[PDB]
């Protein structure tokens, strides 16, 4: 019974979290800049990984 | 973990015994008209029109309109489908077995995620100030428009099962996108809306224009010269090119290399295993169109803000809405024949990119889809079928000799068809024609195989 | 290079082509489906233009 | 954004093209052998009129109004063009539709019309199509008829009770509506109940008397009057009789389907016999010698002996020496020579399949493997007693002409059930030449060899049945 | 929870008609 | 939910008779036959034992079987003695006695007893040159138990072939061979002698 | 605060329409299902047994006649369930071919359920009648039915000897 209540609370927390993150374009302008900076950092890391993959492919080709 | 949410979400009842083919076709034809009439109806409370349309290039791939009841369209269904297919492929949760209750909970979770994302999309569309302004429109109409969008989202997400659970001949997603392309073709052909750009008003339709410009114009030579091939509005030549591409793709879909096979569990029975030249049909061009639309949207959204930059200027420069002199410009298809003839390097690089991308996408998708030689040969060995060769000819060798060539050739072939239909000037993009042909062909084959 | 094109030509030469009767029949069926969907959509949009313009003020 | 044209300038061309594209192709909508016999049965006019009434197709009223409306529209639009074209540098889009549609006068009217249309005509026509494509079943008979006839099925019944279990159809309701029953019921019941002999009706009198709804008793008495060639004395009921014949044939097809799906030997071998008896119009249990054209119960009663419990089939009759002429062609009685000659000339043209080799064979090897696909080859020449289409059935006592089919099924004897459903075909591959016929099925997985019994039962004819015993093999 | 398909189709039709009625009521209140 | 029928119990007889008017002659005769069978079952139950409950079909009372067997034995001795009249008379008496077996008892035992009695009486009738009676008795015998009664099929086929109707005899022996060992050889000999 | 009740009023009238249509459709379907015709002709042994019970209530009737009536009712019910068990597989295999509508399948399901209820009721009543008299009733019922139909067949085959004797005397 207690495990069922804990699972129900976890599911409620998860649905509240997804319902909150889908409304993210309604940010209160407090944490929007930090999220944009984190997204830019993730994009830079992905670009670095892609460049490393291209360099490894060009090296293995030679 | 979503057990308690199961009795709450409504699901369409299963068929009692079975459904014939006529009743199935009637169900489909009656549930598609509802989608259409709902897509053509305007919402309430719309105030601020004539506003820039975000996700414009996605409206061709995703059935929707400007301000109708179907603004959410089918995006929640496909979004949930893609995210959960990615989760299943990446193997994050234990939901892989074919248990009945496992798949039931999986579908329940998919429906719940779809409806919650539909609610989120409706809320963000309302509160982003797209239809109007929350302070200007009022505090009473906002919740009314919210519920008016969420009710339609619920209607469509619950109506998808009416086609998927068994009452429909196919799926629901492959129809709401295959009907809009035929809609666009027929409306581009028989358009009644006139466009008076000076020197007499003309018709937007093709046949209507060929009749009008011929009946009320002197100098019939100059009346047909601007009716057969005019560049401003759709003409007859584009319609004939679309007809030619349609006939060519119908004829080319049928190429198949049958392989002889006889069973070994029950002696004597023969058969054949076909492997079409369009292996993974309409998957590579779909992936390429999705990638092109995604990179175009990214480049446009970056140029709308950081236009004064070096890498942004090298990525793509937009202008009236159409990229030019950039990477997105090279990825953009040529407009017409003269536009292709003015710059040869653009056409060359676009041809090469299209062919290579389609071929490689087919080659890498044939492994994820599960139709690889090492997989289909094992499946046939499990089913009991053995190669009907001369003296115990193996199956894996011939199968792995035939399949990869077929895939890597079909990818380039469908890419070449799309690029030829785009360069020749066929009505609608080549992707639309290919989708509208392939989906209808698959449904015809399914209908011929099931009953009739 | 050229080996891939030769393999493609070989796969084409080995493939069996559809006949004239089968091609004509499948083309007629696909054309029937296409015309049906297109005409239904066009009728819906044409009848909904004036009703929409009367509904919206 | 749009602005409808307030003149007769642009909508004429659009509506003219859209009307022509429908009215032009719609105008095109508005714009094997038989056997030889010089014998015409009694009441030829009635049966021939019913045969002509059987087929009917106009295909003219459905589209005539559409074509005439389209042409009237074309004419009016050409008139409007000719009249208005005389009186007839930015960006502005318009529509080729009239202005009165969007004006404040007819807006409410058109909106109410569209609402009423999409809220009434669509669900009504959808329910119509739904409840219209539900009553007809696969075998072309009302579903209520098949449901009512399924219950009347019994364990073992052959001959007599099949007619009783078959008369409970549904087409007789629509055929005998109103006062059409009591008009004949008394006369038909009296004639059938009295004139017929106990050999042709033994206990079915009870089943005929117990029923009380005169839409089934009338139909059953009429069916028996048809199956006995009773020639009731009035010119109004004969058409109903010859129509109940065809109705009973269709119900016989449905009943064969039902009994075959159930699974038994006696009901199936009885359904086939009653199909033969209905097509040939002879009483089930009477001598099959009545297939010849100029025979009457007196002739068959005088040729095959005074009173015998067996009945001389057509083959044994035609294979006798030249004594039948001294037996039925004397001519103060039974028949004359001028008719007996035509009788023989039409008896020497009936299909009689005589199989000579029926051996199993598996495709791909010589010895059949357990749980494999084995096909039995059966070959025998069509020898009359004396993709080519066979001649039609020589039965001039029903409206429709029946192409003689053949049913080949095989069953065992111990459990008395059927093994493989039959393979009904209706064509051969041209006395005559050596034919060939094939049929495949899945062998049962076992090791012990067992015996089967194949049947060559054919419909549309009575007395042509081959019952041969074969032996299957399983060696592994 | 289950629901019959006819109920689903009638619900969709009632949805469309309810939107139409809302529009026409707004127009009536506007003109009067 | 039940359809009421006005009954009337007769005192000192324990037999019920439907009161005057089911507003239909068919219903009237149906209820009359049903009440006749009901009185029959009531007589059987009151003649069973002071307890009016029927015994289960697992055990079998051997007295009736013993009486049937001794009647069959004395009938066989009387038939082998030379006479046939009193032989078939006592055979019919034994059939009438075995028919008195109630319905709640097992049916296979009575079926086998009637099989034996009918086969023996058919043979005795064949010894009397009475062919139709022998044929109907053989038909009842083979209808009782068709498996293992080779002598039944043989006697039926012989009676037919003697009395004519060769088609019926062919069908009879054909079904015999289909069901089916000296019996098989005798059946083949009779079929060849047709 | 009319602007806050207008959308609530819209949602309320929509939900009310949905519910008032769903309830009406369910009631119509239930009425159509209940309006179906019965499968087999009206039971007669049950009617006789219940009339005997009512005469008992309106009373002196012994219990031997009651036991006979219950035995006959059990025999009738066992014949009915035998017919249903014979027809079930045939109807199931026949429905796939499409030569039989769905109304027959629904009638058959209702008949099977009614027969299950009837057999439960009769075995309960029999257990109420005599101690441990619940399965012996059905054993005796099936044996009685088999013996009765066998005796009927035998009498029917025996009553034909007259015609055969007459025919043989005629042909002689």
mmCIF file of N, CA and C in Angstrom, chain F residues 136-137 140, chain G residues 152-164:
data_model
loop_
_atom_site.group_PDB
_atom_site.id
_atom_site.type_symbol
_atom_site.label_atom_id
_atom_site.label_comp_id
_atom_site.label_asym_id
_atom_site.label_seq_id
_atom_site.Cartn_x
_atom_site.Cartn_y
_atom_site.Cartn_z
ATOM 1 N N UNK F 136 -36.434 -57.108 -41.431
ATOM 2 C CA UNK F 136 -36.650 -56.011 -40.492
ATOM 3 C C UNK F 136 -36.000 -56.319 -39.147
ATOM 4 N N UNK F 137 -35.999 -57.587 -38.725
ATOM 5 C CA UNK F 137 -35.321 -57.932 -37.480
ATOM 6 C C UNK F 137 -33.816 -57.727 -37.597
ATOM 7 N N UNK F 140 -33.175 -53.972 -37.363
ATOM 8 C CA UNK F 140 -33.186 -53.512 -35.976
ATOM 9 C C UNK F 140 -31.924 -53.944 -35.240
ATOM 10 N N UNK G 152 -37.764 -45.333 -29.177
ATOM 11 C CA UNK G 152 -38.581 -44.749 -30.235
ATOM 12 C C UNK G 152 -38.094 -45.197 -31.607
ATOM 13 N N UNK G 153 -36.779 -45.134 -31.834
ATOM 14 C CA UNK G 153 -36.224 -45.599 -33.101
ATOM 15 C C UNK G 153 -36.549 -47.067 -33.337
ATOM 16 N N UNK G 154 -36.465 -47.885 -32.287
ATOM 17 C CA UNK G 154 -36.721 -49.312 -32.444
ATOM 18 C C UNK G 154 -38.182 -49.581 -32.780
ATOM 19 N N UNK G 155 -39.105 -48.905 -32.095
ATOM 20 C CA UNK G 155 -40.519 -49.074 -32.412
ATOM 21 C C UNK G 155 -40.821 -48.605 -33.828
ATOM 22 N N UNK G 156 -40.187 -47.510 -34.255
ATOM 23 C CA UNK G 156 -40.413 -47.006 -35.604
ATOM 24 C C UNK G 156 -39.912 -47.992 -36.653
ATOM 25 N N UNK G 157 -38.748 -48.604 -36.419
ATOM 26 C CA UNK G 157 -38.240 -49.586 -37.370
ATOM 27 C C UNK G 157 -39.048 -50.876 -37.339
ATOM 28 N N UNK G 158 -39.636 -51.216 -36.192
ATOM 29 C CA UNK G 158 -40.408 -52.449 -36.095
ATOM 30 C C UNK G 158 -41.801 -52.305 -36.698
ATOM 31 N N UNK G 159 -42.383 -51.112 -36.646
ATOM 32 C CA UNK G 159 -43.736 -50.918 -37.172
ATOM 33 C C UNK G 159 -43.815 -50.973 -38.701
ATOM 34 N N UNK G 160 -42.758 -51.353 -39.418
ATOM 35 C CA UNK G 160 -42.765 -51.343 -40.874
ATOM 36 C C UNK G 160 -42.993 -52.725 -41.480
ATOM 37 N N UNK G 161 -42.929 -53.786 -40.671
ATOM 38 C CA UNK G 161 -42.975 -55.153 -41.191
ATOM 39 C C UNK G 161 -44.252 -55.428 -41.974
ATOM 40 N N UNK G 162 -45.331 -54.701 -41.676
ATOM 41 C CA UNK G 162 -46.599 -54.952 -42.355
ATOM 42 C C UNK G 162 -46.497 -54.638 -43.843
ATOM 43 N N UNK G 163 -45.918 -53.484 -44.180
ATOM 44 C CA UNK G 163 -45.781 -53.106 -45.582
ATOM 45 C C UNK G 163 -44.881 -54.081 -46.330
ATOM 46 N N UNK G 164 -43.790 -54.517 -45.697
ATOM 47 C CA UNK G 164 -42.891 -55.465 -46.347
ATOM 48 C C UNK G 164 -43.580 -56.802 -46.588
#
